[PDB]
Amino acid sequence: PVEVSQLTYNADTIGNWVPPTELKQTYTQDITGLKPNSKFIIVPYMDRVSSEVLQKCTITCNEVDAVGSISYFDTSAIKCDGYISFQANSIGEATFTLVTDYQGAVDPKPYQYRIIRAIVGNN
Ligand SMILES: [Zn+2]
Ligand SMILES: [Zn+2]
Ligand SMILES: [Zn+2]
């Protein structure tokens, strides 16, 4: 276990949200490989060419006690906003619900996320 005076963060876990296959979709994704039972923040980031076709995605977390929402939008009124606080489950995962509303969806590029972990104690 890491002493509190030695607190650091790891903000290098990045990943992609699976793109929808239809213009309107509600679906889930399990993020895996996280330290079991650790507490995290996930935030959106963007490094992504705009579709110009109004690709909206909203994300929440299904884990008990998770709070927050993440918003993406790529066209004019850009959104890369919100965050979720959550705890990985006992198997190192967390499930998210994605609600997508895309005006057009030909080979849609994934929206992107960053996980922030405080490395302290056993977290
Ligand atoms: Zn799994
Ligand atoms: Zn509670
Ligand atoms: Zn294709």
Author numbering: 4 to 126
Provide passages from the article that reported this PDB entry.
A major factor that limits the expansion of shrimp cultures is, however, infectious diseases from viruses, such as P. vannamei nodavirus (PvNV) and M. rosenbergii nodavirus (MrNV), which have inflicted heavy economic losses. The Nodaviridae genome comprises two single-stranded positive-sense RNA that encode the capsid protein for viral capsid assembly, the RNA polymerase for RNA replication, and the B2 protein for host RNA interference suppressor. While the shell domains (S-domains) of PvNV and MrNV contain conserved sequences of 62% identity, the protrusion domains (P-domains) and N-arms show low sequence identities of only 17% and 43%, respectively. In this work, we have determined the cryo-EM structures of T = 3 and T = 1 PvNV-LPs at atomic resolution, the crystal structures of the P-domains of PvNV and MrNV (PvNVPd and MrNVPd), and the crystal structure of the S-domain of PvNV (ΔN-ARM-PvNVSd) in the T = 1 subviral particle (SVP).
As for the MrNvPd, three crystal forms (P3221, C2221, and P4332) were determined. The structure of MrNVPd (P3221) was determined by Se-SAD, independently from PvNVPd, and all structures were refined to 1.39–2.3 Å resolutions. First, the high-resolution crystal structure (P3221) allows us to locate clearly the metal ions. The 311ExD313 motif on turn β4/β5 interacts with one Zn2+ ion through direct electrostatic interactions. Glu270 on turn β1/β2 and Asp355 on turn β7/β8 also coordinate with Zn2+ ions. The distances between the Zn2+ ions and the side chains of Glu270, Glu341 and Asp355 from three separate asymmetric units are ~2.4 Å, which is in a reasonable range for a Zn2+/ligand coordination. In addition, these three key residues are involved in another Zn2+-binding site located at the intermolecular interface of two MrNVPd dimers. Similar to PvNVPd, the symmetry of MrNVPd dimers (P3221) also generates a dimer–dimer conformation, but with additional metal ions coordinated in the dimer–dimer interface and with a slightly altered bending angle of ~120°. Three key residues Glu270, Glu341, and Asp355 reveal a negatively charged interface and work together with three Zn2+ ions through hydrogen bonds connecting three turns β1/β2, β6/β7, and β7/β8, respectively. Examination of the intermolecular MrNVPd dimer–dimer interaction reveals that Glu270, Glu341, and Asp355 donate major hydrogen bonds to stabilize this conformation (with the exception of the 311ExD313 motif), suggesting that the negatively charged Asp313 on the MrNVPd monomer might exist as a potential metal-binding site without participating in the MrNVPd dimer–dimer structure.
